[PDB]
């Protein structure tokens, strides 16, 4: 059922099916022979047309009603930045430590596109509710790095104040001895310790967010679910659905599903299971 192509092979499918863009997280080239005869041996292109089943999947990515995205990392998540001087402009490379997962649906059809290295893999996927989406993400993350939920209590802090305070804290390497501003907002000693570790020296990170499409427009989720593994526990940061409030949470199975629900409930056009 599943298919695996590189970035150039993916561009050929775009040409063969006249698809312009797909999710930017896949980092392909827009569309405005020897590489073919490879996809013929794998049964992707029969005669000179894309297989009916694979064509269908690619058309979901070509025009989804919804994209739900997960950026995973081993170590600190870099959000696509490679530090290398000779990196060309608009490089299609992704850092060696990143796995990108786009879950797209058009109508009732849920498709997955996973980019790792230079390889994009396409396949059908089973998605029903926020739980099943949380599951897929946690499975993906656990595969990189196992960790238990930090020993902390959920707390809600004002988003603006927490960013300002986290930006100073960053300047001192997120040192727990400089955690006093966060302590004064009423965040636990234990939370400040665990969060400092997750921010200063993570073993694995995950950002989850989404996008929704209407007639003549698009819009991102107002909230992002972020997971980080440091010394003494996985922690879950996400914005409550509303200025704004950040939830800081132990990454329990439950609160992780709550956070995914919040991401999905912060899309601009409402109901996300059924939308078109």
């Amino acid at each position: 059922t599943d298919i695996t192509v590189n970035v150039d092979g993916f561009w050929m499918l775009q040409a063969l099916l006249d698809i312009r863009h797909v999710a930017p997280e896949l980092r392909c080239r827009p569309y405005v022979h020897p590489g073919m005869a490879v996809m013929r041996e794998q049964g992707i292109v029969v005669n000179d047309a894309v297989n009916e089943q694979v064509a269908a999947r690619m058309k979901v990515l070509a025009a989804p009603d919804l994209e739900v995205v997960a950026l995973l990392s081993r170590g600190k998540l870099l959000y696509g930045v490679i530090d290398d001087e000779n990196q060309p402009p608009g490089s299609r490379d992704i850092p060696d430590n990143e796995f990108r997962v786009v879950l797209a649906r058009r109508g009732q059809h849920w498709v997955s596109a996973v980019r790792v290295g230079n390889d994009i893999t396409v396949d059908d996927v089973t998605v029903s509710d926020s739980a099943s989406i949380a599951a897929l993400v946690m499975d993906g993350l656990e595969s990189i790095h196992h960790a238990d939920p930090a020993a902390i209590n959920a707390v809600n802090v004002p988003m603006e104040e927490m960013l300002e305070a986290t930006k100073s804290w960053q300047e001192s390497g997120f040192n727990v001895f400089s955690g006093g501003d966060l302590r004064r907002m009423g965040i636990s000693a234990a939370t400040v310790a665990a969060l400092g570790q997750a921010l200063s020296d993570p073993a694995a990170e995950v950002a989850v967010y989404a996008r929704q499409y209407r007639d003549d427009a698009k819009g991102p989720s107002a909230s992002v679910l972020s997971l980080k593994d440091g010394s003494g526990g996985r922690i879950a940061l996400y914005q409550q659905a509303r200025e704004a409030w950040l939830a800081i949470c132990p990454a329990t199975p439950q609160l992780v599903q709550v956070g995914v629900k919040t991401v999905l409930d912060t899309l601009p056009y409402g109901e996300w299971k059924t939308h078109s």
């Binding site: 863009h21 827009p30 991102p220 940061l237």
Partner: protein, 174 residues
Amino acid sequence: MHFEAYPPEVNSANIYAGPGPDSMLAAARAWRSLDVEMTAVQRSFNRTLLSLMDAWAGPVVMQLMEAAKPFVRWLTDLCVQLSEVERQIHEIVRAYEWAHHDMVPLAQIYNNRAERQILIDNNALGQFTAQIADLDQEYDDFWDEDGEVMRDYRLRVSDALSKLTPWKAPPPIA
């Protein structure tokens, strides 16, 4: 040529750099002059042949006119080709001007990239991540736009050149 192979920093910089169309405009004036002078040449040649005929009517000169017929025709075809060159150079200059105009300015690309880096610098808690992806979509839209601007430029220039057919060698007379 698929210029979408290349990022918008490449397609935009390439169109903004270089000397401009002055040298093509000057060549167009030069080709106009040739059109003018070679039409005069053609007209003088017809008059010379006709007045030779009028001065000495009879078989010898008629056979001379016959042996000149290929060259007279060639000369007419030359003049028709000459009168197309100025036109098509100006069509190409326009094509260049519209490509220059429609291409995405560099500042817009650099700002996208600079804005994106600021969000990343401030993304410890991960809450800018979707805005970061919107900016990547915007960059990809610049890539796309430049791609289609260069496609249309290629096709305009291509059509113009296709109307400038090759010079044929003159036939002899006797």
